[PDB]
Amino acid sequence: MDVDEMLKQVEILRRLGAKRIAVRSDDWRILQEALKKGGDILIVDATDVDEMLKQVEILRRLGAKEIAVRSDDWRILQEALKKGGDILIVDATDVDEMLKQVEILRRLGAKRIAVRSDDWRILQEALKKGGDILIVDATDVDEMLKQVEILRRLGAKEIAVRSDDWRILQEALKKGGDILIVDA
Ligand SMILES: [Cl-]
DSSP: XOHHHHHHHHHHHHHTTOSOEEEEESOHHHHHHHHHTTOSEEEEOSOOHHHHHHHHHHHHHTTOSOEEEEESSHHHHHHHHHHTOSEEEEOOOSHHHHHHHHHHHHHTTOSOEEEEESOHHHHHHHHHTTOSEEEEEOSOHHHHHHHHHHHHHTTOSOEEEEESSHHHHHHHHHHTOSEEEEEO
């Protein structure tokens, strides 16, 4: 998720010093509120190609300087690359499929690729292949801390934690995670 709850979360996280806050939502209304409220990255959820391109253009005309497009369909991500979306968020399931998806995106000139996976094995292979942002899907506070910490001493320079619970994201802020991804 709700607008007043997302604003409240963003405000609390910013008042705790979060320097990179992402707001994820399938509703254009929430994301426009987050931009106005100062959210750093707007994460456009998986939608149709026509609706994704229309939302990207208006977020950009409204002043979004960091737009992320999330999609499991590689067609959307390329069309968002071409439109100029800033972060391409790969939500793949198969390992060898992910590095395949990442490699074409990078050859096409994607300068900011994010890989999203609850499986730490995929995220490491993404770190190996040079993905720019590792998006950890959280579930347990001590499990996320473990994954964040291993990823960090593996050399991950940009770690994002995704959670719908303010508890996990504050722990990720406390632990030094780079991007806090407010789920809605
Ligand atoms: Cl995401």
